[PDB]
Structures are given as C-alpha cells and as structure tokens.
Amino acid sequence: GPKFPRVKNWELGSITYDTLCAQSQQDGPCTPRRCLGSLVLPPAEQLLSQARDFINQYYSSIKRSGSQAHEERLQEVEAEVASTGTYHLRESELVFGAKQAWRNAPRCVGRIQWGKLQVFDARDCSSAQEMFTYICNHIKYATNRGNLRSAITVFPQRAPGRGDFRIWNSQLVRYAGYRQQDGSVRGDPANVEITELCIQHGWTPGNGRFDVLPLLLQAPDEAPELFVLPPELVLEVPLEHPTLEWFAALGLRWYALPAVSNMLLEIGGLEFSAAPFSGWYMSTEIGTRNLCDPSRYNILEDVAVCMDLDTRTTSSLWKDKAAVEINLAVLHSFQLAKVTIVDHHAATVSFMKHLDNEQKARGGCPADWAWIVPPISGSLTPVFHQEMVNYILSPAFRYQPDPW
Amino acid sequence: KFPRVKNWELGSITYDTLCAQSQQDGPCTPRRCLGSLVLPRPAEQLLSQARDFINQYYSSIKRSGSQAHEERLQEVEAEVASTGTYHLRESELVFGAKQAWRNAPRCVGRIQWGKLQVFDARDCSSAQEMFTYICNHIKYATNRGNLRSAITVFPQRAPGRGDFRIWNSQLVRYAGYRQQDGSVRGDPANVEITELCIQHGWTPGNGRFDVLPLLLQAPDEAPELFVLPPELVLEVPLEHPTLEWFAALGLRWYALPAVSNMLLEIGGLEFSAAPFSGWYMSTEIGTRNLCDPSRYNILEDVAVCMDLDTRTTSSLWKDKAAVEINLAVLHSFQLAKVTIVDHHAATVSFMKHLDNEQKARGGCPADWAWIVPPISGSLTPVFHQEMVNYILSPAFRYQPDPW
Numbered sequence: 008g009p010k011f012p013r014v015k016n017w018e019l020g021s022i023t024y025d026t027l028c029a030q031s032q033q034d035g036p037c038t039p040r041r042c043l044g045s046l047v048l049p050p051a052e053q054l055l056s057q058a059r060d061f062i063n064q065y066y067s068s069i070k071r072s073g074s075q076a077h078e079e080r081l082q083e084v085e086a087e088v089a090s091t092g093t094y095h096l097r098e099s100e101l102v103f104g105a106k107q108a109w110r111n112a113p114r115c116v117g118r119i120q121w122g123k124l125q126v127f128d129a130r131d132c133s134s135a136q137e138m139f140t141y142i143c144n145h146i147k148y149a150t151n152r153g154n155l156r157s158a159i160t161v162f163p164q165r166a167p168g169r170g171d172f173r174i175w176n177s178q179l180v181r182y183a184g185y186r187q188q189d190g191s192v193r194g195d196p197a198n199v200e201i202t203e204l205c206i207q208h209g210w211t212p213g214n215g216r217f218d219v220l221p222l223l224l225q226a227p228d229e230a231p232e233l234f235v236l237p238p239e240l241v242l243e244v245p246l247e248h249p250t251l252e253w254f255a256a257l258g259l260r261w262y263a264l265p266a267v268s269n270m271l272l273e274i275g276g277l278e279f280s281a282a283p284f285s286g287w288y289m290s291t292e293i294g295t296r297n298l299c300d301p302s303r304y305n306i307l308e309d310v311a312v313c314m315d316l317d318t319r320t321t322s323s324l325w326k327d328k329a330a331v332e333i334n335l336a337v338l339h340s341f342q343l344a345k346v347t348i349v350d351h352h353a354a355t356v357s358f359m360k361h362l363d364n365e366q367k368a369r370g371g372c373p374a375d376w377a378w379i380v381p382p383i384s385g386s387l388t389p390v391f392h393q394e395m396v397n398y399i400l401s402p403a404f405r406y407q408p409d410p411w
Numbered sequence: 412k413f414p415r416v417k418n419w420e421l422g423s424i425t426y427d428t429l430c431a432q433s434q435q436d437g438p439c440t441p442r443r444c445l446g447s448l449v450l451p452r453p454a455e456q457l458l459s460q461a462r463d464f465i466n467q468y469y470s471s472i473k474r475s476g477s478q479a480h481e482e483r484l485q486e487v488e489a490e491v492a493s494t495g496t497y498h499l500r501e502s503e504l505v506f507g508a509k510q511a512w513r514n515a516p517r518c519v520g521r522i523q524w525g526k527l528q529v530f531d532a533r534d535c536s537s538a539q540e541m542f543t544y545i546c547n548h549i550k551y552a553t554n555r556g557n558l559r560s561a562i563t564v565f566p567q568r569a570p571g572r573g574d575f576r577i578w579n580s581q582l583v584r585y586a587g588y589r590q591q592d593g594s595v596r597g598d599p600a601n602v603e604i605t606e607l608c609i610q611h612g613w614t615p616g617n618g619r620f621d622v623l624p625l626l627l628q629a630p631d632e633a634p635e636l637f638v639l640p641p642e643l644v645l646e647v648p649l650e651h652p653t654l655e656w657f658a659a660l661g662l663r664w665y666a667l668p669a670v671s672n673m674l675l676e677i678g679g680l681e682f683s684a685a686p687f688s689g690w691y692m693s694t695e696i697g698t699r700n701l702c703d704p705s706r707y708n709i710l711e712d713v714a715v716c717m718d719l720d721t722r723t724t725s726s727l728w729k730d731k732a733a734v735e736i737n738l739a740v741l742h743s744f745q746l747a748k749v750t751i752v753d754h755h756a757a758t759v760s761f762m763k764h765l766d767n768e769q770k771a772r773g774g775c776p777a778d779w780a781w782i783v784p785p786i787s788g789s790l791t792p793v794f795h796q797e798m799v800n801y802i803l804s805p806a807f808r809y810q811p812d813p814w
C-alpha cells in the first residue's frame with residue numbers, strides 16, 4: 008500500500024490515507040518508543056525559510072504557484088528580512104493565514120466554518136486604550152445581538168527586543184473567582200490568580216458567583232492597564248430547564264461569546280501574541296466542562312439532589328443523569344434567547360463532514376482525538392470512531408506563557 | 412527525555428521511568444502522532460527476550476543472581492541453542508500471564524492483576540481436549556456469578572507448523588444472521604463468523620440472542636465445531652428499576668467477557684490461543700454493544716418508548732436514552748447477582764492502580780482514549796489524568812484471522 012498513515016472509520020468501515028502530515032515541518036511529543044497524545048502541555052536562518060514556506064502556501068490558495076507575482080513577493084521578503092530582520096504581512100495574506108491557522112488547530116471541532124471568519128486588522132494599534140476599543144469593536148461585531156459571528160482581531164507582532172502586546176486574561180469573558188478565608192472559592196475558580204491580579208492592579212471587586220471580569224491589557228514595555236467592559240455590551244444567558252421547573256431557580260448563567268485571548272498566533276514566522284478570536288459555544292463546554300468539573304463551578308451534586316437522586320451510591324448513575332440535564336438546560340436556555348449554540352452531536356456530525364472536505368482538498372486533517380470527541384456521550388457521536396492523525400502545521404496557534 | 416505527567420483535577424505531577432523499559436515500537440513518531448489508531452500495520456534475539464523475561468521472574472520473587480536463576484537461565488540457553496527455542500516452567504507462565512494483563516495499556520480493570528487464575532493447557536493435542544479446557548475455564552470463571560479473573564494457555568507456537576487457534580473472538584458470543592434485505596438479525600459484528608460455523612456444519616437458530624458454537628483449531632486441522640453446554644453460560648435478562656415497560660424489550664446479555672483471539676506473548680514465546688475472562692464494566696454492555704450503530708443499535712428504539720423527540724439532536728435523546736440503557740444494565744446484574752462494575756467505581760479504582768504502579772514499577776502505561784469510558788467521560792478522574800502509552804513485555808498482541 009501507500010507509505011503514509013492509514014485511517015479507518017470503524018462505523019462506516021471506510022479508509023483514508025493522510026498525505027498532509029508529509030508537510031508537518033514541526034516535531035511533536037511522541038517518539039516511536041512512546042505516545043504522549045494525552046499530554047496537554049507539550050534569527051535569519053529559520054525565519055527566512057519559515058516565511059518562504061507561508062508565501063508558497065499563499066500563492067497556492069490563489070493558484071498562482073511559481074509565477075512572477077510569486078518570486079517577486081519572495082524577494083520582497085528576502086529584501087525586508089535581510090536588511091531589517093523582519094517583514095510585514097500584506098493584509099490579504101494575514102487574512103488567508105489567520106484562516107489557515109483555525110483550519111490547522113487540531114484540537115477544534117469547530118472547523119467546518121474555518122473559511123467563514125472575519126479578520127479585523129488591528130496592526131496599527133498603539134496604546135492600551137486603542138487596544139480596548141478595538142476589542143469592544145470585536146465583541147459588538149461578533150456578538151451581534153445573538154446571531155454570533157466568527158472573528159479575530161490582530162494586534163502587532165513581536166519585535167526584536169521591544170515590548171510584547173498582551174491581553175493578560177485568557178478570555179475576553181471570564182467570571183471572577185474569589186478565594187475564601189475557608190479555602191472554597193466564590194465564583195469560577197478557573198481564574199482566581201487573575202481575579203487576584205485584577206484587584207491588586209486597581210479593581211474594586213464584587214461579592215458574586217458570576218461577577219464579570221474586567222480586562223487586563225498591556226502595550227509594549229508599558230505597565231499593564233485595566234479596562235472594564237460596558238455591561239449592556241456583555242451578553243449573558245439565564246439558564247432554565249424545559250421540564251424541571253426548579254432549574255431556573257438555581258440562578259445559574261453563562262455568557263454568549265467564547266473569546267480566546269491568551270494565545271499566540273504564528274504565521275510565516277511572525278508572532279501575534281495578542282490576537283484574540285471567538286466563535287460560539289458547543290453546549291457541552293458550558294454544561295460539562297465549566298459547570299460540572301469539580302475543579303470549576305462543579306454544581307452536579309447540587310443539581311442531583313434537587314433531582315432526587317441517590318448519591319450515596321456511585322452506581323445509581325446520578326453523576327451522569329444530572330449532567331445530561333445540565334447540558335440540556337444549557338441548550339434549551341440558548342435556543343430560547345435566540346443565541347447561537349450547537350450541541351455535541353450536531354457539532355461532531357459536521358466536523359465529520361469537514362474531515363471529508365479536507366480529505367479531497369489537502370489530503371487529511373490533523374486531529375487530537377481526545378479533544379475532538381466530546382466530554383459526554385463520546386461513543387454516540389460519529390467522530391468517536393474516526394481514527395485521527397495529529398500533527399503540527401503552520402500557521403498555527405501556540406499556547407503561550409502568562410505575562411507575569 | 413523522561414515524561415512529566417500532570418493530573419489536572421488535583422495538580423498531581425509525576426514522572427514515568429517505566430517507559431524506558433519499552434522494547435518494541437509504536438506507530439507514533441515525532442512528525443505525526445497516531446496514538447488513536449486501533450491496530451498496527453535471528454534466534455539469538457529470542458534468546459535475549461528470554462533472559463530479559465526470565466529476569467523479570469527471579470527478580471520478581473527476589474532471587475535474581477542466586478542459584479536457581481543462574482541455573483535456570485542456562486536450561487534456557489541450552490535449550491534455545493539446540494531446539495531453536497525453549498519452554499516455560501509453569502509458575503513462570505503464571506508470572507508471565509499476570510504481568511501481561513498488568514501491562515496491556517488498554518485495560519481499565521488492571522487493579523485486579525494480582526488476582527488471576529492460570530490454567531496450563533500446554534499439554535493439549537486436539538480440539539476435543541481444547542473444548543474441555545474451555546468448558547472447564549468458563550465453569551470456573553462464571554462461578555455462579557462471583558466472577559473470577561482467569562486465563563487459559565494452550566500450546567505455544569511451533570516454528571514451521573500450524574497454530575492452536577480459537578476462531579471465535581470471544582467465548583460466549585451472539586449469532587448474527589444476515590437477511591436478504593441487507594438486514595441483520597442479532598449481533599452484526601459476528602455476521603461473518605456465524606456463516607463460518609454454518610459452512611463448517613452448524614444448525615442456526617433465528618432468535619436475536621443465540622450463543623454461537625465454538626470453532627477450535629489445532630495445528631493444520633480444518634477447525635471443528637463444538638457446542639457450549641446450554642448452562643455453562645450465564646445470561647442476564649435486562650430490566651430498568653423504575654421503567655416498568657423496559658424488559659418487555661426482551662433484551663439480555665451474557666455474564667462472561669472472554670477473549671479468544673489475542674496472542675499472549677511471554678518472554679520470546681507466542682501463545683496463539685490463550686482465552687481470558689474477568690468481568691464486565693457496564694458501559695461495554697450498554698454503550699458499545701447495545702447502542703453502537705455498527706451493532707445491536709437499540710438507541711432510537713429505547714428513546715421512542717422513553718417518549719422523546721427523535722426529530723432533533725438538541726433534545727439530547729440519544730444521551731438521555733443511553734443513560735437508561737446503562738442504568739438497566741447495572742440494575743439487572745446486581746439483581747441477577749452477577750459481578751459488574753460501573754465506569755465510575757472502575758475508573759476510580761484504576762486511578763488508584765495508577766498510584767500503585769507509580770510507587771511500584773515507577774510508572775505504568777495506559778491508552779487514554781481507551782481507558783476513558785465512552786459515556787460521560789469527563790465525569791471520571793481518568794479523563795483529567797494524562798497518561799503515557801508504551802509497549803512492555805510480556806503482553807497481548809492482536810493476530811490475523813486464521814483465514
């Protein structure tokens with residue numbers, strides 16, 4: 008057979024061969040001795056070439072490969088890199104390659120949509136204030152009354168030893184997390200450290216489970232500045248359950264927009280550091296991950312007592328039963344504010360459609376199985392049975408250090 | 412070089428040095444990770460797998476150096492040098508077997524690995540004699556419901572010449588009878604094997620749940636058809652503790668999960684037939700068997716009596732249902748007094764078995780994707796617990812079907 012990896016789909020029994028990975032100019036975390044798939048955290052020469060690389064990708068997506076437009080941009084960068092030691096992205100490239108990056112992140116079921124993404128250029132940005140309105144612009148656009156829209160705003164790149172452009176928070180939207188004199192945490196304990204940095208960087212706090220965090224921002228070299236969001240700007244959703252009348256009463260809630268912010272966008276060698284993006288939620292992130300992880304909000308037990316469930320015993324499956332209902336109330340509450348959501352089946356079925364598109368076009372789709380298969384009802388979704396190949400294609404997103 | 416392994420529910424942080432023992436390659440490389448792939452694609456080396464293994468033994472009982480070791484390591488050299496091969500003393504096989512369960516990185520029940528019972532069938536020379544070993548093994552392991560972990564090990568693998576093979580994949584299995592309409596009565600992933608039993612002379616039922624007979628193959632024999640004494644096998648009828656109407660579905664399942672097709676590799680040697688059984692963790696029954704689309708696929712059915720909008724995915728019927736299937740699997744076995752374990756209890760204990768190896772062998776390999784239950788995955792601590800996968804020895808391989 009072919010010498011590239013073979014890829015069976017145990018539901019449909021169908022095979023594909025991933026010829027894409029042949030281009031992963033970037034090593035992972037596995038030796039042939041062992042596999043670290045599970046594992047969550049894992050100067051001229053090499054720039055010139057990483058850049059050359061992306062340009063070639065670019066001209067290929069506009070089908071002009073090998074043509075003079077091409078060898079002329081290649082020499083427009085050689086010029087640039089040689090005599091100054093960087094270069095800049097013609098807007099339209101930044102757009103293509105900001106897509107390429109979403110399309111390339113092997114941990115994201117959301118990709119059918121990859122080609123539908125609004126890139127806003129924010130490369131002119133020159134301050135912590137300017138920064139902010141850019142973001143509010145982003146949020147308004149992409150929240151869009153409730154009819155959510157994939158968006159990414161891109162602030163300036165790394166420069167040779169010049170300050171980096173950082174959004175300090177991980178999301179544009181987090182809830183506060185307040186450490187008790189107990190040892191419990193009031194709010195979302197996900198982000199305590201940051202709730203901390205907030206106060207002792209100027210913020211007068213709140214007293215609530217869902218206190219909407221204000222934004223730590225930071226321009227090159229300048230000290231980190233602290234901006235708060237317009238409240239009528241920040242669309243949340245009260246939660247309720249179609250049938251269980253008492254759910255609405257638990258007083259729970261999430262917020263429309265899922266906006267990642269703490270992550271480095273890497274294109275053709277250049278570094279974006281502050282380039283936050285946001286789509287819409289899949290119902291399991293809210294109702295399983297954020298609301299049910301015990302190292303988070305962890306309601307669950309709570310909901311299952313009102314459920315009338317036998318928790319003394321593990322095997323009554325109260326842990327599961329309850330969580331189903333949670334998600335459903337996550338779903339129903341969203342469906343009902345006319346806000347954009349998408350259940351885990353719905354998402355997976357379309358991610359599968361995606362895999363097939365990528366197949367015809369690029370010859371595979373990098374995937375981090377553990378992350379693609381939803382946190383509940385794994386085996387009931389189609390992806391569960393698709394073997395996946397993971398690898399690192401560039402342009403991509405990188406995890407990056409916290410700025411402190 | 413040595414893998415740091417953090418848990419994310421507790422911030423535990425640990426280091427696996429037991430991986431450095433791995434001696435055989437996985438499909439992963441630095442370029443591209445294929446962790447999620449189901450299955451893979453002279454005589455002086457046999458000799459060094461022997462020492463390596465034999466060491467594992469005397470070393471295991473704290474003797475590695477003193478007489479017996481030194482002596483018994485030379486029986487081996489003596490034997491290999493002049494037969495191309497050797498044979499395992501029995502108490503050693505019982506070490507090999509125990510170890511290879513402990514080793515296999517896909518197994519969530521490994522905490523039990525000490526409590527295994529090992530039948531030596533090395534002396535078997537016919538599919539008659541085999542049938543016994545099997546009938547006897549099932550009678551032991553079913554134990555009226557108090558299921559006991561047990562392997563049985565048929566003859567090893569003579570260089571040029573056939574293999575002892577069980578043709579079934581499990582012991583107890585359900586007949587899957589194809590209809591013309593591309594329709595399939597019974598268990599669809601047994602469709603092939605049924606017609607083999609057929610073509611080799613068996614009389615079919617045409618009930619949904621019909622225990623398939625056994626094709627046993629001694630070397631270079633056309634396999635022979637043997638039928639499981641109706642009650643050596645224990646089934647559980649399925650009811651739901653609160654959903655009165657359920658059991659009128661007629662659905663049921665056998666108590667013994669027993670692997671009939673994997674190659675027990677011990678210290679060089681290959682035991683091409685070495686069935687083993689312990690006990691079911693329920694999600695295998697409810698979640699794979701009963702609901703997998705490629706199978707008995709009753710998800711829709713259950714939902715519709717449950718009285719739920721199939722129309723849309725956003726009503727979450729499939730999961731709602733699934734939990735009740737699963738709940739019926741748990742009740743019924745506890746009612747029929749038949750050892751079973753829920754993904755929770757199990758994964759919880761697996762975690763502990765992880766901490767045991769950690770302070771024991773200094774590590775342990777698990778296959779995250781396989782060790783994490785199919786439903787409600789993140790509601791188990793295995794989910795948040797980074798694992799390393801690597802190939803130790805002794806251990807179980809897969810093997811090509813004897814056709």
Ligand code: HEM
Nearest residue numbers: 109112114115116117120157284285286287288289292404
């Ligand atoms: C359009 C709707 C989208 C959906 C439904 C979606 C869904 C998801 C989900 C469920 C995950 C797994 C994360 C977890 O549960 O921990 C994920 C990962 C990810 N997605 Fe999306 N996503 C969407 C849009 C986007 C957009 C616009 C981008 C960026 C352009 C994006 C990039 C990523 C990245 C970079 C990760 C993993 C990065 C990390 O490890 O932090 N997704 N996505």
Ligand code: HEM
Nearest residue numbers: 512515517518519520523560561687688689690691692807
């Ligand atoms: C005693 C109670 C046991 C429990 C609860 C248990 C649980 C499991 C489960 C759920 C699987 C995964 C199969 C699937 O997800 O479809 C598995 C895999 C496996 N287990 Fe166990 N197991 C037990 C005993 C044993 C025993 C006694 C052995 C052999 C000595 C064994 C060896 C294996 C092997 C070799 C695999 C994976 C190989 C394959 O791909 O089929 N397990 N275990």
Ligand SMILES: Cc1cc(N)nc(CCc2cc(N)cc(CCc3cc(C)cc(N)n3)c2)c1
Nearest residue numbers: 177178265267269284285286287288289292406
């Ligand atoms: C300790 C730690 C640090 C760190 N940086 N990341 C993690 C992993 C968890 C995670 C963290 C963030 N900020 C975002 C997501 C995707 C959420 C998402 C994004 C988008 C764009 C859409 C969507 N539906 N969901 C997952 C752990």
Ligand SMILES: Cc1cc(N)nc(CCc2cc(N)cc(CCc3cc(C)cc(N)n3)c2)c1
Nearest residue numbers: 580581668669670687688689690691692695809
């Ligand atoms: C090559 C190949 C062929 C084939 N037909 N199927 C596979 C898939 C893997 C698999 C195969 C079998 N027979 C049994 C299990 C559950 C195993 C199990 C055993 C015990 C003892 C307990 C438990 N809970 N689960 C898993 C691979």
Ligand SMILES: C[C@H](O)[C@H](O)[C@H]1CNc2nc(N)[nH]c(=O)c2N1
Nearest residue numbers: 045046377378419794795796797
């Ligand atoms: C330990 C485990 O590998 C890790 O927590 C991963 C597994 N799968 C995931 N899947 C999603 N969607 N999101 C996550 O944060 C994780 N976490």
Ligand SMILES: C[C@H](O)[C@H](O)[C@H]1CNc2nc(N)[nH]c(=O)c2N1
Nearest residue numbers: 391392393394447449780781785
């Ligand atoms: C493609 C994937 O690796 C394969 O389907 C695995 C994943 N997880 C599983 N989990 C369980 N419990 N059983 C299985 O057979 C599998 N199969």
Ligand SMILES: [Zn+2]
Nearest residue numbers: 042439444446
């Ligand atoms: Zn790997």
